[PDB]
Amino acid sequence: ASMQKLINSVQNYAWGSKTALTELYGIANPQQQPMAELWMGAHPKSSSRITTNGETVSLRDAIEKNKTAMLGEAVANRFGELPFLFKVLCAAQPLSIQVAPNKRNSEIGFAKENAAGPMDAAERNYKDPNHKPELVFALTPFLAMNAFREFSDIVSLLQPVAGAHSAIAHFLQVPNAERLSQLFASLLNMQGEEKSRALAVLKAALNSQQGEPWQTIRVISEYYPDDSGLFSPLLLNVVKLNPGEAMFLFAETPHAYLQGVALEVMANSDNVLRAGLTPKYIDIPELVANVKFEPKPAGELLTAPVKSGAELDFPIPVDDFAFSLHDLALQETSIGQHSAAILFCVEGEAVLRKDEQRLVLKPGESAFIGADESPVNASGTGRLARVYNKL
Known part of the structure; x- marks a missing residue:
């Protein structure tokens, strides 16, 4: 199938909201676990899955089998993997203040530490050598900290x-x-x-x-x-983002997520330097x-988006990922990119179409579009978010 509805993981971190994903999207939670993050991507700790035949497979394994076709040649050669992870974040409480080192210092840090070997200790800062640029996009009113006054x-x-x-x-x-x-x-x-x-x-x-x-x-x-x-x-x-507003988290800059629900797009790194x-x-x-x-x-502080036709692009000053919102209407609009894309229904209802295939997404559901399957036509009501690469 050209378009793959995602089966996504929900991290039940103790800080997560017991109700936010249910109230927004109707995701079930009968035992009232904390639902902190909904992950859309191919992270090895918990990859999203796609359905083949009837069987499910890890998106990560599927990309692995088929990198150029799935990611596109540009992403395949630059990164060698899906270069982003896309989340819905839903804390019940304020989270730690963090700083993301830049790419050079993350490399230096990752090497300085190996040469003194220990991964899961508390002295350790650098799990990998990647930077971690990130965008947050508010779904509900979102309180954060970002950068010095x-x-x-x-x-x-x-x-x-x-x-x-x-x-x-x-x-x-x-x-x-x-x-x-x-x-x-x-x-x-x-x-x-x-x-x-x-x-x-x-x-x-x-x-x-x-x-x-x-x-x-x-x-x-x-x-x-x-x-x-x-x-x-x-x-x-201290920033109070209204729904629909976004902020790019630059390197070397303290920030924190304090309250509310957001989409988060990040480069792949597990490095967390707290402050x-x-x-x-x-x-x-x-x-x-x-x-x-x-x-x-x-x-x-806020990213100024740019509207062209039905597309609202949020310019990101790195190559690792790009992010856009797409208005939906009765008349289809074509959504295409040179890369893999994940499409997420923010509100309303999305009908995706590729040739003869139709796929409906309700709010909170997402699909993976491999590079070889671009473009798809979208209609319905409300808005679709897209994570992709502009390379």
Whole structure:
């Protein structure tokens, strides 16, 4: 079959929503497990499957058998694999702050660590040498953190808590990238009485400061009462994405997913460098070496999409993946690409057609389109998201 409806995995991580996938898409959950992520792709931990004959097969194994045909020649020769994983993300709670090292440093990190051999230890930062560019696209109102605030913004937010830590006072005295780096490291390295002091001052400020990002700190404190990451909304932009809005997560930049439901598209890497809101050991020197202490103005945080006909493209500044939304109507529109694609029904109902084959997707369902099977015609109502490669 030219178009392959996907059988996808749902990760039941303890942080996931017990209800979000059910309420959005009607996915069953009779025993009320946490449903954290719905995976669309060919990840070796849990590949999506396709149906042949009647038998199911791993999408990963199927691509493996047939790389050029499935991925296209460009993707096949550049990456050697499907170069992205596409998820629906549905936490019940705020998640860890993370930084993605760039490609060069991920390579260096992966090698530095092997030469001292241990994969599943807590000292380990680099599971592979890939970078991890990512886009998030809000499905429901989505609260996140991304990038450092303008320095003057940080100064204003830190004034009320100047007494929490001497690193704050030091930054306030000269608010520059050097002292921002020292502050960031100082905060994450707070211990014992130094840490209880700082957290006591912060929690007292919440009673006298109103609005954001103070409210965001309250939200986080429900789950991370004893985490130096509670100060992060004062350093990092807090963003409330409306459904349909997106943000690209650049390298070397702290970010976090705090509340809501989104699509996530990422390059393939299992590397996770944390920067707070975690009980795990953090290697602060390694983290600091992979952070660019440059402000990002709020006006620059969301990706500006571009509409052409029925297609809304979200320009991504890397080659690893591309992302577009497609309006559906009665009159078919042709959706084609030089690569493999995954198509996901965001809302309404999608009827895909390739020659004689018809495939209906309801919201939350997806299909894989191999490169050799492009283009397909789409009709119906609502919108289809597509992950692909523009190479």
